[PDB]
């Protein structure tokens, strides 16, 4: 009805960029991404002046629709043209940084995020208010430094992102998970308390959903005890999940299981683990009333094979909780999948700090079936192993298979020290616009 109104208006106006823009928003609402791009492109073209906010939003939406369609070169072209028209709009350099991040060029992304922060030269004025203009740069800077294993700068930017948007579970989850690597649970709870992570019982339960799944038993315990007036059946479910991490035999009423599902504390991975440990629980009945009775039948009754993603999700939970007996049970089931399944199993063990087990699986896999992450793991393992000959060998395998992935060129640069000059050049040939590579070439000329 709103669209039909706009389509009558554009029949008698045609030359109004604003009507076309409004049609693009409606196409956006209805998910017609192809027609939204065309309408937003027409609104930008028909603009009479550059000061219209909707003319700015047109370029932003064009860039986004292009980004959603993985047409990154064309998105960056739209972004750069728009930065030149409107140099005080931060969504355009933000989106450039995001594109660079998902295309694995972290130092170039980092550079842009930092310049968005505390910029006394450009008076940035947002054109959309989805998030606080400074949440996204801090969050992504924290993400980059974490991946670069700079845990201090990660925590600093994760905490500043939290100050901008304290209901974002994502950065809360990141700080807890990062701190769990290095600190006592009580120290982690004290940090959570003085920054007021647990703003309510509800928020505590959403946090508990992450901490139990990662196997943070003591921290989950301190969290749940700090909560007041938790509906008893939800408390029981939480207690049982914590007790399960500690290998207590799981005993839980059907009521606590059902409310544990309703609060999203219990998924099909939990139910399978509990059925494996305690066959008396009414879990078969519970699962078949939740459309996951196929999961039950595959894992326990020789039933038909479930999707590999769902099987890997049950396997992941067992690995993450340290449930090695159940994990071995689950691994015997892999032989009904194609051989390529062992590439993902290898990835799982490596993610949860089982590099030795993961290699056992990586050796099972034909090199064509190894994921990019797998290459990255094997390079990291071999560099930590001081076998830089073999490390560089896998990095070149990465370049040839995944010619567009930045990380394998960078690995070949960092390792092949007696050829760094040619390596940076070979990288620049595939990434002519990457600014870090030029910083690196300048550093070999300073050394040479």
Numbering used by the authors: 183 to 630
Tell me what the authors wrote about this structure, in their words.
Listeria monocytogenes GmaR is a thermosensor protein that coordinates flagellar expression by binding the master transcriptional repressor of flagellar genes (MogR) in a temperature-responsive manner. GmaR forms an intermolecular complex with MogR and prevents MogR from binding to operator DNA, resulting in the derepression of flagellar transcription. GmaR is a four-domain protein that consists of glycosyltransferase, TPR, linker and antirepressor domains.
GmaRApo is segmented into three domains (TPR, linker and antirepressor domains in order from the N-terminus to the C-terminus) and folds into a tertiary structure that resembles a duck swim ring. The N-terminal one-third of the TPR domain corresponding to the α1-α6 helices forms the vertically protruding head of the duck swim ring-like structure, and the remaining C-terminal part of GmaRApo corresponding to the α7-α27 helices assembles into a circle at the base of this structure. The N-terminal TPR domain of GmaRApo forms a twisted semicircle using 14 α-helices (α1–α14). The TPR domain is connected to the antirepressor domain via a four-helix bundle structure (α15-α18) in the linker domain. The antirepressor domain consists of 9 antiparallel α-helices (α19-α27) and forms a curved HTH repeat structure. The circularly enclosed conformation of GmaRApo is stabilized through an intramolecular interdomain interaction between the TPR and antirepressor domains. The interdomain interaction is primarily hydrophilic with eight hydrogen bonds and salt bridges.
